[PDB]
Symmetry: C4
Subunit: 299 residues, 4 copies
């Protein structure tokens, strides 16, 4: 299991989460070969996101794309942590954005992001939610729209005078309370979802895949229980997730990013220590799967 | 008729309006048990409104919820005034918001409020409508949307150098002119309703419940008569309400709130005395009923 | 033809345009009887527009409403100029608004006005369109919405150091070129209409009434010809209207207003002389007809 | 091939692009005959755009309109460059706008332009896209709306301390790679298109005319490939256009404008030299064809 242009190894936290590192040579060739397109050009022309994607897959002998797809579609795995040797300082923020864009567009397409107005977003924490000193709860993304979100991506840009603040993760077949909530009649009841500042949507909190196994579509801030029966059941569901013993805690140094299957993984973030001269900065992307396979058709 | 955790007694104004007071011990236990969620957290996660609701009902031995439901659904009653010993100064505004949220979410759910952007709203009067020195006319809430609003809630936050300004109320089976307006062909004619700064709606001013008795959906500022036949009839309807001898006048001290069935009760507010150093502050919520019962179903 | 509370006489400009004047006594009784509702209250509660309407019709022994209706629906007439003795200075602007509101709501209802945000609008000219020194072209109102506008109302509020600026009017059975444009196949072709800052509408420039006679729906600023065939025909139509010999020129002193049938009359405004200390001010309303009559119905 | 009021000659760049020049006499008569309508009046009343169009065609003995139509609808030609003797300085900007409006409205109608809020737009470059020092890529206009855009118009207003910056053009039957991309199954696959700051649209990148020949609807900034199959194919399509040997390079002096068939021509712009005192200014319009012809009809 040795690949062309990168190395792949299980993480220190779980065998379901794989670490993928691009070599110093692959890194410096990719940055040379995309130096003519600044970050502003990727924002303007979306076919260029698939072009820098092909450039990176070609530099890895067309082994990157089927590997990313097999890993993200395998019920037993479904998640990755990614970096490139030599890209690791806040003064290299532009190079970091280019690298994350190429990986996403081998597996599908990244959707528009309302908070930045682009296909990605950057934000700073001092002294999503930028509230220091508290934990961010585990959730799926994309629950408040009709089309399914298949994947989520998150990258670290700067860090100064900083203690704490790791990322958190949870897989459904590691969640000890799945069968109890899935066999409840409310697991198959469609419910309402809504975000703060368009239209509301209706779907169950659980569904099944093609073989009959469970998948989830949940976040505490945006689900809207219609009555006391739904609302109590959901607050019990929230506690059963946040106190799960299956949660992973992952540091993300300046230069690295996570990428996960959004149907059977959830994610979040830990609290940190205050300091008068503290600084932290992040970047994110989200989207759907699209790929080739052999199946029936007519005419 | 002695209950666990609270006392219940008819008001000095009418036997249709009941006063419900939480003991100093229930109050201090509820504030301790919800101290980890500040008001900002209830704004962010709506299942937490049903959680603080369950916490309060459990502290009353599951006697609060069937009592609130029986009272609000009984055609003969339908209204309540509520407070908690020890919570009574403008410096305790945050504690007041928490208490009102728990009561509402035992009977149904509170709807989004466009003037504050949250599920509740706070406003100040000096020197809805903040016009001093004039009366606010009796009405139902929610007339300018399609779904029915089943209940209304209103709470007092501060008061300084203040004379006057009580709340006003009216029940349909106490209104001496009901039969005259209900048997008119215009009582069953659908009419247009519209608010100031979306879409208009069409419904009659009167309807019936399941037994055939009358209910109302009326406010003077937002109904829009289409011709001289409808417009004269409505201005006669307005005078017949504002001069009714069945109206109740209720002071609401710092710390107390009203909660009423919006289908067969109407509500309003009295005028007050000017003073250079005067100050008054309020809070409100509105929503629909949802509960369990035995009835037919298929498949 | 002597009426209770007012006098009625043909104008100096045409027998199709009648002048209606309320006596000093009717004026001072109406202003007393509506003094408890300031202009701000008519803005807030629309049934009060039909109430001040009934108050004025009652002061005229229920002769005003059938007279206004017979006049506006008669193909041979269709227009009025209205005033009240003693109301004639810029310091009485509020009294003027009250009078015009009562007349309109005996015949139908005035529609929302987007430029002021109320059911009426006021504007000032110095040194619709506030361009001094040029003529405003003849048109119908309401061409860019789906529902028909049956009437138009316009009132004068102030005037200082001012020469020129009369109102202009034209009736279709006085227009020498009607038959030529009505028998053209393009008279019955639906066309597109659009305003500057929602949705566009499609209707012919001409139609017929129930007997088969012609009516119009035209304005130069908002009709949008789709091709050279429609566009040339419309610019010829515009010249044939602006140079018509049937146009009337009407001064409107501080305190008076016009009110006309919008289906077979058009209206506009003349140019004026500049002066460093010049000032002029106006008010308008628009709406549809609604009234009782004997006709067939089922069930 | 000598015409009344203007001269017509093939350009120095291609026989598919014809140059049309109005004489000094036609120019000074047109400016006199439209001097009563300033640019502000053409903005307000759209039938006046067809009026100044008829005025110009009449000054050319009704030979301009069938010539413009025959040229733009002929698959072998389809493009023009236009000017008027004596109109050539930034102080004559208003006269330039009037001339371009008259030509467009003989062949069809110019659509609303969102960046200026009028039927045309003006913009300045210093030191669409105003980025100095880089090339603007070849494209069709109107790809992100449902109705077809048949033509495009572009005019030069000022130029100071300026080196470089010509216009660029490409005809499909001059494009060496047409057959290769047209016979691909993706040429007939409907795809999604979207602009930055309403609704998205779906159409193939290629279609056919009534005889079965190819036409195009493409721009790199607004097409949105749905997967890696579409996205790679489009980035190959972009390179095959930008490096085509069939591209024309056209200077456009102060006072001249281009006008082209948008179904089988594409267009763009070259880079230029920096200078502390540099200045350049432009104007544009776009729309659809509408004209008379002999064909079948019913009833
Ligand atoms: Fe997230
Ligand atoms: Fe209310
Ligand atoms: Fe008008
Ligand atoms: Fe363009």
């Amino acid at each position: 299991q040795d690949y062309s242009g990168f190395t792949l190894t299980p993480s220190a936290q779980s065998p379901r989460l794989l670490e993928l590192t691009f070599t110093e040579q692959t890194t410096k060739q990719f940055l040379e070969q995309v130096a003519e397109w600044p970050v502003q050009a990727l924002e303007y022309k979306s076919f260029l996101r698939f072009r820098v994607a092909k450039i990176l897959d070609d530099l890895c002998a067309n082994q990157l794309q089927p590997l990313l797809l097999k890993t993200l579609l395998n019920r037993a795995e479904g998640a990755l942590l990614i970096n490139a040797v030599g890209v690791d300082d806040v003064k290299q923020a532009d190079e970091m954005v280019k690298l994350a864009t190429a990986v996403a567009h081998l597996i599908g397409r990244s959707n528009f992001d309302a908070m930045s107005g682009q296909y990605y977003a950057r934000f700073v924490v001092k002294n999503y939610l930028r509230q220091p000193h508290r934990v961010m709860e585990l959730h799926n993304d994309g629950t408040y729209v009709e089309e399914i979100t298949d994947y989520v991506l998150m990258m670290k840009i700067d860090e100064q005078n900083m203690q704490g603040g790791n990322s958190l993760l949870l897989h459904l077949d590691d969640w000890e309370h799945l069968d109890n909530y899935f066999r409840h009649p409310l697991a198959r009841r469609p419910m309402r979802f809504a975000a703060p500042p368009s239209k509301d949507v209706f779907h169950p909190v659980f569904d099944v895949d093609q073989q009959g196994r469970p998948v989830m579509r949940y976040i505490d801030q945006f689900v809207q229980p219609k009555d006391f029966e739904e609302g109590v059941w959901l607050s019990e569901l929230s506690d059963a997730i946040e106190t799960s013993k299956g949660i992973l805690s992952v540091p993300v140094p300046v230069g690295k990013f996570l990428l996960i299957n959004n149907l059977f993984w959830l994610h979040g973030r830990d609290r940190f220590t205050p300091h008068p001269d503290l600084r932290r900065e992040l970047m994110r992307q989200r989207g759907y799967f699209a790929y080739a396979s052999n199946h029936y058709q007519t005419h």
